[PDB]
Amino acid sequence: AHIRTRKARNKELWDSLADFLKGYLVPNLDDNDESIDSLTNEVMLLMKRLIEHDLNLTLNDFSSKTIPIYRLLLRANIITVIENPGTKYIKLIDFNETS
Amino acid sequence: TAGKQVEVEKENETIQELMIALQIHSGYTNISYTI
Amino acid sequence: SIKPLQIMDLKHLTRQFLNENRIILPKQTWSTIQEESLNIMDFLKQKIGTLQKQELVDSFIDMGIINNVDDMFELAHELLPLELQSRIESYL
Amino acid sequence: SLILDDIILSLTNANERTPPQALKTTLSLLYEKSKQYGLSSPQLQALVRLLCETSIIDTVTKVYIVENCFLPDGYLTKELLLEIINHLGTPTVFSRYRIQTPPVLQSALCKWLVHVYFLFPVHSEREHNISSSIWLHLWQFSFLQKWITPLVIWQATTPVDVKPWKLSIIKRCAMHPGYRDAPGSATLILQRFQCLVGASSQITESIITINCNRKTLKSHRNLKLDAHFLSILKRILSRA
Amino acid sequence: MDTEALANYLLRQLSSSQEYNKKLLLACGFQAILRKILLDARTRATAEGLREVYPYHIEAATQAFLDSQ
Secondary structure, three states: OOOOOHHHHHHHHHHHHHHHHHHHHOOOOOOOOOOHHHHHHHHHHHHHHHHOOOOOOEHHHOOOOOHHHHHHHHHHOOEEEEOOOOOOEEEEOOOOOOO | OOOOHHHHHHHHHHHHHHHHHHHHHOOOOOOOOOO | OOOOOOHHHHHHHOHHHHHOOOOOOOHHHHHHHHHHHHHHHHHHHHHOOOOOOOHHHHHHHHOOOOOOHHHHHHHHHHHOOHHHHHHHHHHO | OOHHHHHHHHHHHOOOOOOHHHHHHHHHHHHHHHHHHOEOHHHHHHHHHHHHHOOOOOHHHHHHHHHHHOOEOOOOOHHHHHHHHOOOOOOOOOOOOOOOOOHHHHHHHHHHHHHOHHHOOOOOHHHHHHHHHHHHHHHOOHHHHHHHHHHHHHHOOOOOOOOHHHHHHHHHHHHOOOOOOHHHHHHHHHHHHHHHHOOOHHHHHHHHHOOOOOOHHHHHHOOOOOHHHHHHHHHHHHHO | OOHHHHHHHHHHHHOOHHHHHHHHHHHHHHHHHHHHHHHHHHHHHHHOOOOOOOHHHHHHHHHHHHHHO
8 A cells, every 4th residue: 555655756756857857957958059858858868777777878878968967977976987898888876775 | 566666666766866966966056855 | 395295195196096906015116106206297397387278188188198088077086076076077 | 033134134135335334233233132032043044045145245254153143043944954055065067157155154054053963853754864865965075074074974873874875975085085084084974884783894894995094083083162152052042 | 185285286396267277187187197107017017927016117117108108
């Protein structure tokens, strides 16, 4: 009976994150000459890529339009960047682990 | 599975911790407590 | 005049870098790095005493330190404290 | 009392162009009645934000107002820490249009939060998780570390608070050149995690990787706390 | 000593906002060279199969630097 309040909370985080991207983070990028929804989707995709721990996410997945995002994650110290190719993969640190 | 409710609880946790870090390090000035 | 730079200061500017690799310096090597810390500082003190905006990091690519300015930020991230990182970011 | 609002509401209207001796009157009037009636938490919210956004007060006199008139008449509001929090940090590429507040004023705000820690309000546990990670993130600002580390420590109560990802954040920052004091402040936080969760191999070996002289750690464990400020504060809290 | 500390150290033996930042850039340049040199040194100390960087490796690598670069 305790499950549909957390799935309730789960959408109210997704759209909170979304509303914050569309609302603040992506407008303060102001690239693509004015493509706020053409870019929000770029960025929204990237965050669900990060949140779902897509291992295929690499540095090249950042347009030169979205590369500040990458730099922002880097500054906050909340991603790990590791290279056999000379390419570099990006995953979120683990917030759930307890050991 | 009642163990995949323990998975939305874990992505519930990362979105939360993710926003805090975006907000702080992007100079956001409306940091609060969202439900 | 304090031209020879402190050993303990070196052992701090780099102790993460050493641990993060294989590097095991005895105290004897530590002195050696000190006297070399001079001729390495000696080098670039005549390299370009001209302080330029644009070629500052262009000078640095020429030295074989980096390839572009993205690499310089990856250096800022690992050598500067948080708030200077946000600064330098806008400088580039 | 109600007087401390024409005071505060006036400073709000001050700017460039105000007769500077008119100003010094209102400030002394603030210094005076704040020590007497103490400050009502909503007033305290309005005060701290003008202190962080206006240009028309010397910064070292701002510090003075925090050191000599930030005297709450009870428990702190949560909307007050948010107001402080929303004014801490560095100007970033997404936030260059932002009014940013002198770092010295920032750290002094934090030092002040240390003095009134016992007046923090009760957090729901979800709220406590959030607050615990904000201060850890903020802890990384090199010029807030001295006074943040007590807050990140004192909030460490249950072993739920201490998790691996908080550890590297700490360990990264201790080992990180371009920070001077961070190894001291970091071991401290760690020892409090040790002192809290018990064994945990990760923590104990991190502390080893950070060698501190055992005497910076004794200069870091003891804080001077300005007895004159808590004096006046006890008096205020006694009265009503 | 931290990196900003190292910045003013460097410039005092030689010599406004945009010029502050370059001072920092410069301090990262010193540590960047310096660690290139220690990494060069480690490899030729591991070439010879050794546990530990010995001093000659250091002056090898340091001149191996100033020659090529």
